[PDB]
Amino acid sequence: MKLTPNYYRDRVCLNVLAGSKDNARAIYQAAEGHVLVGVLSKNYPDVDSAVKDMREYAALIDNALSVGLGAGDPRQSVMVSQISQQVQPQHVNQVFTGVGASRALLGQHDTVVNGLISPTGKVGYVKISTGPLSSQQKDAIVPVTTAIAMLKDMGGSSVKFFPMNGLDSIDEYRFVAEACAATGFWLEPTGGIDLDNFEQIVQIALDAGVTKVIPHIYSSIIDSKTGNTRPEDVKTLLDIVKKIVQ
Amino acid sequence: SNAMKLTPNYYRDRVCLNVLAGSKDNARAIYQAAEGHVLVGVLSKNYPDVDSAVKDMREYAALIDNALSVGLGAGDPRQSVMVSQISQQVQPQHVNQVFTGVGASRALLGQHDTVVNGLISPTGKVGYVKISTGPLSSQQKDAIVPVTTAIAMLKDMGGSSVKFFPMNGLDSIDEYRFVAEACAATGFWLEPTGGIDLDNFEQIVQIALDAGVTKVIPHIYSSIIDSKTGNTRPEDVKTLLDIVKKIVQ
Ligand SMILES: [Br-]
Ligand SMILES: [Br-]
Ligand SMILES: [K+]
């Protein structure tokens, strides 16, 4: 079963949450396969139960599975590394201090492992103290290029730039995308992305020269009555992707 | 194919050299010296017909695990149709074409793995490239078009990369840089060609990598060829490899 995401035209793959197993199947079909379906470690009492249920999801969607911390929660980073070791998904969400352990325990470099780093309000400078203890200490704020080189040194695949707050951090995001393009590194914009800002946010990464972009799109496409990601919103997003990835 | 690989062996999925062979033994030595991260050019113009070119190029391919680049011969557009016919039969990793030969070559290849470049040229004007590089069109008034539009036409024709030629080394640096940023933006690949030597190679490749170009196939020809033998110097290929390993990180 494949360990790399199904990028559309090798450039863009959606990342969205599933509300259930049936929703995961529908999302996977709506995206024509060009999606990673997020399942949260935080929903299981232990590693064994999470691994079991995630392999059930993986089987429905040809392994197009993204293992989630749950809202970037660093307290889930160890459990994510353990779950991902057994599940061998296509995608893993990590915080900056959990990238090395996750890569090492996966035992291969095909699974995409992202590394959560955060806007600071100043272009070119990012917060990287995003682990469970380090997130409680004075912030570690470093140059974007150096943060990327450190993620690469630790075996990471991509930056998760979070929380973006939609377009509120757009100049910082653009500088990160330009730095990713220059280093061969991939990019996952996350936080407040929706049907109105998604095209611009992806277009900025594309125009900067980012090789692979994995946007995450969550509450803005989720039906609150069922907790499901709406398949019609996934198609709307896939149409945008086909329009701008040529 | 006969299960031979149809895509170049890029080093870390980013950069693959392209250099000419002066003989079969030379092709083997080059392939060794590059640790396989090379496409070895053999030229259609060196053969009297399609069948003989196919036969001979199949022999080269066998020595080098298909790491063969079918050449026009110094981008000569009169060889364009023969390159399309040769490439159909040989199924190499790489094909050099002029802009007006990309669609026929891709169609006769019958698959999209083999890399097919399309020759487009500096104009002196950043953002604008000459695309009338086929046998008849090269003799008419230049067709000059926006870089982004030339890339989109190459994609529409089945092409994989821009061959930007003649670069004259660093002489067209501002134009080259623009092309590199436009390829990175559009997910398209780039093959800088013309006047590259061991002293400007790093800077020329670094420009493409800093722009974010996903695959870069630089061409390095007479500056590394021993004119006494016609053979590409395997030690010059090693020096190139070492730069690639330094900068592709
Ligand atoms: Br997460
Ligand atoms: Br040529
Ligand atoms: K760029």
Using an 8 Å CB-CB cutoff, list chain B residues near A246.
152, 155, 186-187
Q: Which of B152, B212, B249 sits opposite A209 (nearest CB)?
A: B212
Taking CB atoms and an 8 Å cutoff, what residues of chain B touch A206? 185, 187
Q: Would you tell me how many other CB atoms lie within 10 Å of the CB of residue B228? A: 6
* Cβ A168 vs Cβ A136: under 8 Å: no
Q: Is the peptide bond before B122 cis (omega within 30 degrees of 0)?
A: no
DSSP secondary-structure letter at B38?
Answer: E
Residue ranges near ligand 1 (ion) with Cβ within 5 Å: A 68-69, 93
Choose among B37, B59, B55: nearest CA to B47.
B55
Rounded CA-CA distance A231/A222 in Å is: 9
Residue tagged 């296509």 (tokens): A90
Alpha carbon distances (Å) from A149 to A45, A157, B32, B242, B245:
35, 11, 31, 21, 16
Superfamily of domain A2-246: Aldolase class I (3.20.20.70)
Q: Can you tell me the distance from the alpha carbon of A124 to that of A169, in angstroms, rounded to the nearest whole number?
A: 12
Q: Are A206 and B185 an interchain contact pair (Cβ–Cβ within 8 Å)?
A: yes
- Percent helix, strand, coil in chain A, to 5, is 45, 20, 40
Alpha carbon distances (Å) from B63 to A18, B15, B49: 51, 21, 22
Residues with CB under 5 A from ligand 2 (ion): B 71-72, 75, 96
With 0-12 / 13-18 / 19 or more C-beta atoms within 10 angstroms meaning exposed / middle / buried, residue B15 is buried
**Cβ contact (<8 Å) for B184 and A184?**
no
Residue for token pair 């280093």? A183
- Which ligand lies nearest the alpha carbon of B44? 2
CATH of B1-249, one of 1.10.260.40, 3.20.20.70, 3.90.1170.50, 3.65.10.10: 3.20.20.70
Q: Quote the CA–CA distance of B179 and B196 in Å, as a whole number.
A: 17
Tokens of A28: 């996977």
Q: Which residues of A touch B249 (CB under 8 A)?
A: 152
What residues sit around ligand 3, an ion, with C-beta below 5 angstroms? A 181, 209; B 184, 211-212
Report residue A16: phi and psi, to 5°.
-140, 160
* C-alpha span between B40 and A68 (Å, rounded): 46
Closest CA to A97 of A71, A113, A70, A74: A74
A131 with A113: CB under 8 angstroms? no
Contacting residues for B130 by C-beta, under 8 A, at least 6 apart: B120, B121, B122, B123, B142, B143, B144
CB contact under 8 A, A210 and B213: no
Instruction: Please state whether beta strands B17-20 and B38-43 pair in parallel, antiparallel, or not at all (unpaired).
Output: parallel
The residue length of chain A stands at: 246
Asked if B10 contacts A211 with a C-beta cutoff of 8 angstroms, the reply is no
Interchain pair A182, B214: CB under 8 A: no
Give the Å distance between the CA of A193 and the centre of ligand 1: 14
Q: Is-cis flag, bond preceding A189, omega within 30?
A: no
Query: Resolution in angstroms, to 1 decimal, for this deposition?
Result: 1.9
To probe the interface with B, which of A12, A13, A211 has the most B CB atoms within 10 Å? A211
In angstroms, the Cα distances linking A217 to A191, A221, A222, A242, B115 are: 8, 7, 9, 17, 35
Q: Where do the structural domains in chain B lie, given as residue ranges?
A: 1-249
Report the residue from A152, A210, A245 with minimal CB separation from B212: A210
> What is the C-alpha separation between A29 and B31, in angstroms, rounded?
44
> A207 — contact with chain B (CB < 8 Å)?
yes
